[PDB]
């Protein structure tokens, strides 16, 4: 059980719906300003238009 636990410890122990898209939009923003997170959230969560 100890050796099995050692391999289990190697395995990670204890939402991100649009985190990657919002992060990539934030990195390439070409804007020196506040850029509030609400704007990024509304832009990256359209899903319709």
């Amino acid at each position: 059980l100890q050796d099995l636990k050692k391999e289990i410890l190697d395995s990670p122990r204890s939402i991100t719906s649009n985190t990657v898209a919002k992060s990539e939009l934030q990195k390439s923003i070409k804007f020196s300003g506040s850029i509030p997170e609400i704007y990024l959230d509304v832009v990256t969560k359209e899903t319709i238009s």
Binding site: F31, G33, I35, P36, I38, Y39, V42, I48, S49
Partner: protein, 527 residues
């Protein structure tokens, strides 16, 4: 003048309006459809209805006056402070444009169509109906009595208007209702004129995107309504006393009645050039300004301002708006018979000219002065710009030189020889030339006055060329002597330039005169 003011073939004059036009079946159906769509708050479909048949057919779709008021109210709902409300109203932005922007574009395009009546492009009946709708909207937009700081009438009984049951479009009160308040119309004008030159992003967005275009549309519509009132509402032949009373009831008279204040000349001069480069004279009291529609001075977090405008662009637009306001004021003033003065508005042409001249002479920045005195079309602003230029030149000569030479250049525009002789007389007196009295310490202020005086002379020369053309520049010895006197004035300025008080060369008008009518510096650079 044009067909716009002289087309009364299909009009049905009524007690309320002399321009009333009856509706045909197709126009009635269109009006009913637009009102029905407006009732369901489906503004996107209303804009689509207006845009889909715009310019694609010989016939013209006439926008109803209530729909015109709805578009005016929509124009106030800018994205920068109303983005969530607009997104909620139209979650699928199929047009990819703000409702306010689409409404403003439609209003400007329809105003452009109304300004020139193309009988070949559009049938006269549709053009007259559109003129009637715009005039009804202007009559509903009548300003209330000025405050220092009846609900709805439908002329057409064929259909029920959407505005009868509602006073707000998307949480914003109707523009006609908002402007029909004692302290709102003047407040709106002061707010837009102050925010025209404001560096603050919310204030700049509030006027540049909303108030500046709406004010321009209102000024153009009021000018057209004034032309129609003078053409038809008057009794033609008059005893010169009833005409003054009718002019006091003119739409421009009501428009400027809301800006009468206590003294029209000084307060009007301060209002038109509010927040400009000129130093405020006599510590005039500050004019209160507040946002018209809730938080116009706030930007919503969702909107991101990604547009930057250069100070020159903002100054050019602001000075153009100021020129339009001054032109409307002078257009109202010129109709007044000589000797008689208007009763309801305490306005005098001489007082306005003196106030504008005092404000222009007080400018410490040449760029704004040039923007005010440079116009794309001389004929459009020919009635008041020469008078302002002459007054500013007279005041500059009065402050710079102890001797005030009376200027008759405006009446001398008719004869080039008289104008050139007067210019020779003025330059001989050395009033036009740099003054030796001015100290070396205040050389920059003297140069600032001289360049403004040169700008005024250039404007007068341009008007003289517009009135007489180029026919006797060298054939008449008087014009050649005037050019030689200009060269002598240039030599006088060069004397101070050789004095080497400052590295900057004093402004010389000889190259500009040579480009305009100097025939390449006479013989200096003809070769």
């Amino acid at each position: 003048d044009g067909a716009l003011i002289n087309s009364v073939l299909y009009v049905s004059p009524r007690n309320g309006a002399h321009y009333f036009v009856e509706l045909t079946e197709k126009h009635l159906l269109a009006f009913e459809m637009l009102n029905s769509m407006c009732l369901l708050e489906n503004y996107d479909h209303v804009l689509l209805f207006l845009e889909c048949q715009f310019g694609k057919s010989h016939n013209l779709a006439v926008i109803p006056f209530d729909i015109i008021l709805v578009l005016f109210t929509l124009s106030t709902l800018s994205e920068y402070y109303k983005e969530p409300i607009l997104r909620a109203n139209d979650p699928y932005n199929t047009s990819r444009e703000t409702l306010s922007r689409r409404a403003l574009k439609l209003l400007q395009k329809y105003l452009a169509i109304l300004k020139e009546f193309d009988s070949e492009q559009y049938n006269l009946y549709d053009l007259e109906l559109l003129r009637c709708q715009f005039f009804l909207a202007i009559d509903t937009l009548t300003p209330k009595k000025q405050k220092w700081g009846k609900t709805f009438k439908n002329p057409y009984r064929s259909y029920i208007s959407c505005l009868e049951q509602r006073n707000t479009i998307l949480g914003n009160r109707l523009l006609n209702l908002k402007l029909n308040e004692p302290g709102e119309f003047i407040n709106m004008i002061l707010w837009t004129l102050s925010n025209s030159l404001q560096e603050s992003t919310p204030l700049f967005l509030s006027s540049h995107e909303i108030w500046m275009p709406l004010l321009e549309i209102l000024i153009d519509l009021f000018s057209c309504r004034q032309d129609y009132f003078i053409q038809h509402e008057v009794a033609q032949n008059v005893s010169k006393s009833l005409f003054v009373q009718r002019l006091s009831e003119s739409p421009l008279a009501v428009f400027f009645e809301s800006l009468n204040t206590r003294n029209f000349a000084n307060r009007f001069s301060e209002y038109v050039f509010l927040n400009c480069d000129y130093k405020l004279p006599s510590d005039n009291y500050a004019t209160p300004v507040h946002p018209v529609y809730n938080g116009e001075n706030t930007i919503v977090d969702t909107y991101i301002p990604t547009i930057k405008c250069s100070p020159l662009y903002k100054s050019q637009k602001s000075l153009a708006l100021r020129r339009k306001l001054i032109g409307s004021c002078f257009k109202l003033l010129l109709r007044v018979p000589d000797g008689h003065r208007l009763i309801t508005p305490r306005i005098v042409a001489d007082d306005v000219i003196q106030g504008i001249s005092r404000t222009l002479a007080s400018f410490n920045d040449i760029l704004q002065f040039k923007k005010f005195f440079m116009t794309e079309n001389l004929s459009q602003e020919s009635y008041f710009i020469p008078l302002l230029a002459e007054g500013t030149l007279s005041e500059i000569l009065k402050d710079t030189q102890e001797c005030v030479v009376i200027l008759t250049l405006v009446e001398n525009l008719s004869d080039g020889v008289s104008f050139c002789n007067e210019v020779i007389g003025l330059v001989k007196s050395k009033c036009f030339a740099f003054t030796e009295q001015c100290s070396q310490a205040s050389y920059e202020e003297a140069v600032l006055n001289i360049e403004k005086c040169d700008v005024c002379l250039l404007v007068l020369l341009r008007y003289l060329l517009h009135l007489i053309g180029t026919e006797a520049i060298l054939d008449a010895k008087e014009q050649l002597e005037m050019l030689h006197a200009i060269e002598k004035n240039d030599s006088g300025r060069r004397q101070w330039a050789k004095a080497l008080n400052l590295g900057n060369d004093p402004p010389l008008l000889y190259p500009i005169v040579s480009q305009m009518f100097g025939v390449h510096d006479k013989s200096v650079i003809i070769e």
